[PDB]
């Protein structure tokens, strides 16, 4: 719980200020990456393919995508 | 250890930056052994972003 305290807080706040909206971005980035890889319609299967076994989270992935612009 | 001249991960930045900032603190605790030197060293020690540097000491 304390290396945890100082993992708010290791680099600072201002590594983790950065980090954290770096992560975001990267969220952001991630998705959409793997979202435009040549055109919707086919890369939209490789999106299916990835996690197969569940659909709930991909429920909020397609939902996100949807206002790219 | 094996990549090296790599990409850097998280702490390695906060590694170089703990070295980057131990030298920053012995010119600050040179300074308190010996602060006379201070004035001089700020003409040598502007050398940098000179034209910018002289102006923040004077704003404060």
Known sequence: SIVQLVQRYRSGIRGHMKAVVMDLLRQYLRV?????????????????E?????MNTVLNYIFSHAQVT | LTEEDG???????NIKCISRDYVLKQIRSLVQA???????????????????????????
């Open chain 1, 32 to 48: 959409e990456t793997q979202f435009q890889n040549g055109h919707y319609d086919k890369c939209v299967f490789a999106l299916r």
């Open chain 1, 50 to 54: 990835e996690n197969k076994s569940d």
């Open chain 2, 7 to 13: 990409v850097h991960s998280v702490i390695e930045e």
């Open chain 2, 34 to 60: 010996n602060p006379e030197v201070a004035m001089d060293s700020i003409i040598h020690m502007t050398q940098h972003i000179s034209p910018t540097q002289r102006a923040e000491v004077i704003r404060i």
